[PDB]
Amino acid sequence: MQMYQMTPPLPEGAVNRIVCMTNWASLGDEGRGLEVRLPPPTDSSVHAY
């Protein structure tokens, strides 16, 4: 009688893109104090160059 439902693994939306976000899913130690997080192409990813 219970109902189960899972959050879908893949994204949903009109447009879906691949981006570069280092350690976006890291869980263990804090890691090196250095990251690279590009914004989605809808913004000005010019600060990274």
Binding site: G33, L34, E35, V36, H47, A48
Partner: peptide
């Protein structure tokens, strides 16, 4: 945060010297 450092002063000086105005008032566009 990201790693970034100021450019050498000499380069910045010469670079800033040559920067023409992008938009100017011209009374003609025909």
């Amino acid at each position: 945060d990201i790693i970034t450092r100021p450019t050498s002063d000499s380069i910045a000086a010469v670079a800033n010297a040559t920067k023409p105005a992008a938009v100017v008032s011209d009374p003609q566009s025909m």
